[PDB]
C-alpha cells in the first residue's frame, strides 16, 4: 500500500478531473511523473484577471491524500493572498485539508480566491491595504499585471 | 541487533508499534511503552522517555518476565486483557497478529480477541479501494451517513492529521467521531499535523519578502539580513510589497514614508 494507494487515488482524481473539469481549469501529470502536475486557470470573467492565462504547479505528497498537495503559481499575479514566489494562502491547502478533498476542489477554491480575496488574513499586506482602501486602484493594477505577466 | 525490552522484537513498522525510542541505554517501542498494563508514568515528558522513568521501565520488564504470551508461548508479556473475566497476557505485536485491540485513552486498556470492543455493522473514500471483507478491518462512524472506512486508512489519517485536525471527512465532526474512533482502537497523537511538522514546512510561504534589490547593496551582512532602526532597516514597495531594500541603498529618508520600487513606477 502507501505509495501505491496514493498513485491509485491520483489516477482516480485525474480521470474525474478530465470528465468533469472545474470551470476555467485544466490540469494534468507532467510527463510520466504523476506526483507532479501542471495546471492552468483562465482568469475569471468579470474579474481584473479576465483574459489572462495563469499557470500553476502541483506536487502531490507521498502520503496523499493524507497530506494536502503543494500548489503554487508560476505566473506573477497581483493578489492579497499570493506572494512573489507564487505561494497561496489558502485554508484547504494547510489547516482545513481533509483526505476527502480532491485536487478538483482545490482548483475551485483557488478560482474562488481569485474572485473573492481574503484581505483580513493576507499574504501580501500592501496589496490587502490597497484592496480594502482603494478598490479601483487595486483592479487597475491587477489588470495591468494580467496584461504584463499573464497575456 | 536492537530490540524492545517489553515485546522483545525488532523495531518494525512505526505505523503499528510507534516510534522506536532508544535513550539512556534503553530501547522500547512507544506503543509497547504506553500500552503496557502496569507501567507507571511518573515524570515530565522531558524527563526520561516521555514521562516514563527508566527505573520503572526496567521493573516492568522484570515483572513481564513472569508472564507467558498466549500467542507465541514465550515469556515477556507486558500487556494483559482488561476484561474482568480474562487472564490472557500477550506481547503487543503478538496481540496484533491475533487481532487484539488496544485503546489509547484513559487507562490505555487493551483487550484480546474474545473480549475486544465491537460496533454494530463499497469503497473506502480515503484510499478509493473496496472495503475489506473482514469487518474488523473496517470501521463505521457514528457522526453521519453511517460511513465505513478501512481501519488502516483511518489510522493513517489520525497519525498524519493528528488530534488537532482529526475530524469526520464529511461532516467535520470533532466530538463524537473521534471519541468513537478512540474506543475502537485508533491512535490519535496529541501533536501538530504532519504537514506542519515537515522540515521547512510553509517556510517560503509567508516568509515576508526580506531582500535588498538595489543596484548595489551598502551592507556587509548583505541583501539577506536587516535590522530594526537606522539606515540598515528594511523597506518594501508601496504596492507590490515584493521588492525591497536597505534604506540607504536607495539613499532615502524618514521624511517621505511612501517607497515605490522601480517596477511600480
Ligand atoms: Zn515493543
Ligand atoms: Zn508473544
Ligand atoms: Zn480477554
Ligand atoms: Zn481505505
Ligand atoms: Zn460525519
Ligand atoms: Zn542593501
Ligand atoms: Zn513594487
Swiss-Prot record, chain A:
Ranges for the UBC core domain? 5-151
This protein's source sits in the domain of life called Eukaryota
Can you list the GO cellular component terms from the UniProt entry? cytosol; extracellular exosome; nucleoplasm; nucleus; protein-containing complex
Q: Give the record's family classification.
A: Belongs to the ubiquitin-conjugating enzyme family.
EC number annotated for this UniProt entry: 2.3.2.23, 2.3.2.24
Tell me the PROSITE patterns matching this sequence: UBC_1, UBC_2
GO molecular function terms listed in the Swiss-Prot or TrEMBL record: ATP binding; ubiquitin conjugating enzyme activity; ubiquitin protein ligase activity; ubiquitin-protein transferase activity
Sorted alphabetically, the Gene Ontology BP terms of this entry are: protein autoubiquitination; protein K48-linked ubiquitination; protein modification process; protein polyubiquitination; protein ubiquitination; ubiquitin-dependent protein catabolic process
Q: Which organism is it from?
A: Homo sapiens
Assembly with partners or alone: Interacts with SCF (SKP1-CUL1-F-box protein) E3 ubiquitin ligase complex. Interacts with CNOT4 (via RING domain). Interacts with E3 ubiquitin-protein ligases CBLC, PJA1 and PJA2. Interacts with PDZRN3. Interacts with PPP1R11. Interacts with E3 ubiquitin-protein ligase PHF7; the interaction inhibits cleavage of PHF7 and promotes association of the complex with the nucleosome core particle.
Name of this chain's protein: Ubiquitin-conjugating enzyme E2 D2
Task: Give the recorded effect for residue 68 to A.
Answer: Abolishes histone H3 ubiquitination and decreases interaction with PHF7
* Keywords of this entry: ATP-binding, Nucleotide-binding, Transferase, Ubl conjugation pathway
- Catalytic activity field: S-ubiquitinyl-[E1 ubiquitin-activating enzyme]-L-cysteine + [E2 ubiquitin-conjugating enzyme]-L-cysteine = [E1 ubiquitin-activating enzyme]-L-cysteine + S-ubiquitinyl-[E2 ubiquitin-conjugating enzyme]-L-cysteine; S-ubiquitinyl-[E1 ubiquitin-activating enzyme]-L-cysteine + [acceptor protein]-L-lysine = [E1 ubiquitin-activating enzyme]-L-cysteine + N(6)-monoubiquitinyl-[acceptor protein]-L-lysine
What mutagenesis or variant effect is reported for residue 148 to E?
Abolishes histone H3 ubiquitination
From Swiss-Prot, chain B:
Cite the effect that the entry attributes to residue 226 to A: Reduces ubiquitination of histone H3
The entry's stated outcome for residue 206 to A is:
Reduces interaction with UBE2D2
Statement: the UniProt record of this protein carries the keyword Nucleotidyltransferase: no
The record gives the effect of mutating residue 47 to S as: Reduces interaction with and ubiquitination of the nucleosome core particle. No effect on ubiquitination of histone H3
What does the annotation give as the result of altering residue 38 to A?
Reduces interaction with and ubiquitination of the nucleosome core particle. No effect on ubiquitination of histone H3
**What are the start-end ranges of the zinc fingers (C2HC pre-PHD-type)?**
1-39
Tissues of expression: Expressed in Leydig cells and in developing spermatids (at protein level). Highly expressed in Sertoli cells in testis.
Task: Keywords in alphabetical order, please.
Answer: Metal-binding, Nucleus, Transferase, Ubl conjugation pathway, Zinc, Zinc-finger
A single GO CC term for this protein reads: plasma membrane
Q: What is known of its domains?
A: The extended PHD (ePHD) domain is required for interaction with the nucleosome core particle via binding to DNA.
Q: What does this protein do?
A: E3 ubiquitin-protein ligase which ubiquitinates histone H3 at 'Lys-14'. Required for male fertility, via inhibition of SPOP-mediated BRDT degradation when in the presence of acetylated histone H4 in early condensing spermatids. Stabilization of BRDT allows it to facilitate histone removal in early condensing spermatids and promote the progression of histone-to-protamine exchange. Promotes the expression of steroidogenesis proteins in the testes, and as a result plays a role in maintaining testosterone levels and repressing osteoclastogenesis.
Which protein is depicted? E3 ubiquitin-protein ligase PHF7
What species is this protein from?
Mus musculus (Mouse)
Gene transcribed to yield this protein: Phf7
